[PDB]
Design a protein around this ligand. Structure first.
Ligand code: A1INK
Length: 128
């Protein structure tokens, strides 16, 4: 499936080069600009545990998910990944636990040492 493709084709976008955040661009976006720390970011996403026991979709709320980049309002993998994205871009992220919810997890929803997958569309970003 899409997660395996990211394991095999995904770019390692971590500073440490520890394969903790792997990325495939699925649809190229527009312009050269990628968001800066502090920017207000608008996305649609679908997310799952790599074992697919818990699926989540902004589409199920029919409304963008909105967050300020780089403030740790979201897991570290999103601060890293969405920062690399162009407006209009769709990307797949595969995320080791270190960059998601870790050894502790987020029970009962997310188990210890969980690998996460997302598809993310960057709708827009704007300055603080
Ligand atoms: C650990 O708790 C949740 C995790 C996840 C989704 C959650 C969580 O319940 C709070 O609610 C879905 C309802 C909408 N929504 C998203 C958020 N808050 N409310 C951001 C919460 C923080 O989430 C994250 O940092 C990441 C990135 C942004 C999208 C959501 N993320 C998740 O980890 C998802 C999780 C749900 C299970 C499948 C894997 C993704």
């Amino acid at each position: 499936g899409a997660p395996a493709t990211v394991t095999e084709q995904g770019e390692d976008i971590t500073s440490k080069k520890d394969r903790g955040v792997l990325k495939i661009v699925k649809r190229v976006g527009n312009g050269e600009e990628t968001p800066m720390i502090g920017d207000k970011v608008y996305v649609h996403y679908k997310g799952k545990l790599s074992n697919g026991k818990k699926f989540d979709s902004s589409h199920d709320r029919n409304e963008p998910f909105v967050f300020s980049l780089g403030k740790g309002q979201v897991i570290k993998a999103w601060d890293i990944g969405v920062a690399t994205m162009k407006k209009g871009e769709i990307a797949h992220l595969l995320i080791k636990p270190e960059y998601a919810y870790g050894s502790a997890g987020s029970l009962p929803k997310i188990p210890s040492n969980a690998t996460l997958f997302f598809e993310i569309e960057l709708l827009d970003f704007k300055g603080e």
